[PDB]
Design an enzyme around this catalytic site. Structure first.
Site, short mmCIF file in Angstrom:
data_model
loop_
_atom_site.label_atom_id
_atom_site.label_comp_id
_atom_site.label_asym_id
_atom_site.label_seq_id
_atom_site.Cartn_x
_atom_site.Cartn_y
_atom_site.Cartn_z
N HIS A 64 0.82 -1.20 0.00
CA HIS A 64 0.00 0.00 0.00
C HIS A 64 0.85 1.24 0.00
CE1 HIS A 64 -3.39 -2.51 0.66
NE2 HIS A 64 -2.88 -2.98 1.79
N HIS A 94 4.76 6.79 6.74
CA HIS A 94 4.65 6.32 5.36
C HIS A 94 4.22 7.48 4.48
CE1 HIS A 94 0.73 5.99 7.33
NE2 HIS A 94 0.24 6.35 6.15
N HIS A 96 1.99 8.89 0.67
CA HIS A 96 0.92 8.71 -0.30
C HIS A 96 1.35 9.62 -1.44
CE1 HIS A 96 -1.84 6.74 2.55
NE2 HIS A 96 -1.35 7.58 3.45
N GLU A 106 -3.39 13.34 0.26
CA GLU A 106 -4.72 12.91 0.65
C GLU A 106 -5.49 14.15 1.06
OE1 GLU A 106 -4.09 9.34 3.34
OE2 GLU A 106 -4.74 8.52 1.40
N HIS A 119 2.90 10.81 6.39
CA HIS A 119 2.11 10.56 7.58
C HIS A 119 2.95 9.91 8.68
CE1 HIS A 119 -1.96 10.41 5.21
NE2 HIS A 119 -1.53 11.64 5.40
N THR A 199 -6.86 6.72 6.97
CA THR A 199 -7.28 6.90 5.58
C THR A 199 -7.25 5.61 4.75
OG1 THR A 199 -5.08 7.48 4.74
CG2 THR A 199 -6.45 9.27 5.65
N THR A 200 -6.93 4.51 5.41
CA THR A 200 -6.91 3.20 4.77
C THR A 200 -7.64 2.28 5.75
OG1 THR A 200 -4.85 2.46 5.86
CG2 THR A 200 -4.64 3.56 3.72
C1 AZM Z 1 -1.65 0.08 11.25
C2 AZM Z 1 -1.76 1.51 10.83
O1 AZM Z 1 -1.00 2.38 11.20
N1 AZM Z 1 -2.82 1.78 9.97
C3 AZM Z 1 -3.07 2.98 9.35
N2 AZM Z 1 -4.10 3.12 8.55
N3 AZM Z 1 -4.18 4.38 8.02
C4 AZM Z 1 -3.21 5.13 8.43
S1 AZM Z 1 -3.05 6.82 7.90
N4 AZM Z 1 -2.88 6.81 6.34
O2 AZM Z 1 -4.31 7.43 8.22
O3 AZM Z 1 -1.84 7.30 8.49
S2 AZM Z 1 -2.09 4.41 9.52
ZN ZN Z 2 -1.28 7.55 5.48
#
Ligand code: AZM
Ligand code: ZN
Length: 262
Positions: A64, A94, A96, A106, A119, A199-200
């Site tokens: 992802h 991470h 996007h 995002e 993020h 957001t995921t």
């Molecule tokens: C395990 C974990 O951290 N899950 C997440 N899901 N969405 C995230 S976010 N894009 O909102 O930072 S982090």
């Molecule tokens: Zn994120």
């Protein structure tokens, strides 16, 4: 959860609500930040990002995004102040990004997107015993978002993008020691904040969003490196990891606070 969700035509954002009903909840993220509507909130205490030099563990392509995880077994690397009540430990960060320069982030500001968004995901380890538990509570998580715009090459970003070839395939990882996440932050600590969600999937509504006002700058070359990543594993047909972002979701009367005036 993490099942049949992705960013493709059949498992993309528009389909998530089928397996994750919370997708159409009252506080979903990301959102479009209309700056003129953000409420200047002087009462909020200063935002502090106290990160350590060597708390990073590995860099991983999880299918992802490319993610750098940290040791959260202790209270050294945390975010505090701002709208937060107490410290939140950094678990991972991470990105996007998009296939083209005009898409990727995002969150958007006044309808504008950035080529990428970083993020930094933190959790309330002080009052919850596991990230999973904190993720189920409205006050369990805090995510710091940093916008990325293209311009000058970014120094610390070189090491990260240099390591992307090694983790080009889904399911692969490499050691990534002594990377100070502080190096990916702008000079300014001004921010916008609002109650939102992941957001995921699982899209849990347990996130206190803190979106920094000033973006950091990376080169188009470095951006090109992110686009060379793949959503797929080694022996599968290649599908590049791009447009791995969720579009803005309904504001639903939520109030966005700002730590500055503009
Ligand atoms: C395990 C974990 O951290 N899950 C997440 N899901 N969405 C995230 S976010 N894009 O909102 O930072 S982090
Ligand atoms: Zn994120």
């Amino acid at each position: 959860g993490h099942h049949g969700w992705g960013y493709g035509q059949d498992d993309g954002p528009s389909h998530w609500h089928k397996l994750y009903p919370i997708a159409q909840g009252d506080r979903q993220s990301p959102i479009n930040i209309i700056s003129s509507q953000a409420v200047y909130s002087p009462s909020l205490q200063p935002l502090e990002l106290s990160y350590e030099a060597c708390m990073s563990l590995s860099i991983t392509n999880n299918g992802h995004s490319v993610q750098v995880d940290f040791n959260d077994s202790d209270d050294r690397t945390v975010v505090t102040g701002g709208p937060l009540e107490g410290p939140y430990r950094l678990k991972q960060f991470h990105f996007h990004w998009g296939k083209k320069h005009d898409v990727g982030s995002e969150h958007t500001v006044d309808g504008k997107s950035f080529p990428s968004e970083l993020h930094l995901v933190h959790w309330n380890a002080k009052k919850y015993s596991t990230f999973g538990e904190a993720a189920s509570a409205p006050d369990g998580l805090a995510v710091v978002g940093v916008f990325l715009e293209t311009g000058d090459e970014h120094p610390s970003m070189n090491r990260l993008t240099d390591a992307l070839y090694m983790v080009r395939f889904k399911g692969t990882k490499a050691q990534f020691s002594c990377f100070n996440p502080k190096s990916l932050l702008p000079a300014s600590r001004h921010y916008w904040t609002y109650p939102g969600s992941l957001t995921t999937p699982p899209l849990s509504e347990s996130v206190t969003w803190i979106v920094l006002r000033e973006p950091i700058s990376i080169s188009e070359r470095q951006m090109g490196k992110f686009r060379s990543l793949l959503f797929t594993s080694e022996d599968d047909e290649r599908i590049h990891m791009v447009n791995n972002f969720r579009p803005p979701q309904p504001l639903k009367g939520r109030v966005v606070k700002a730590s500055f005036r503009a």
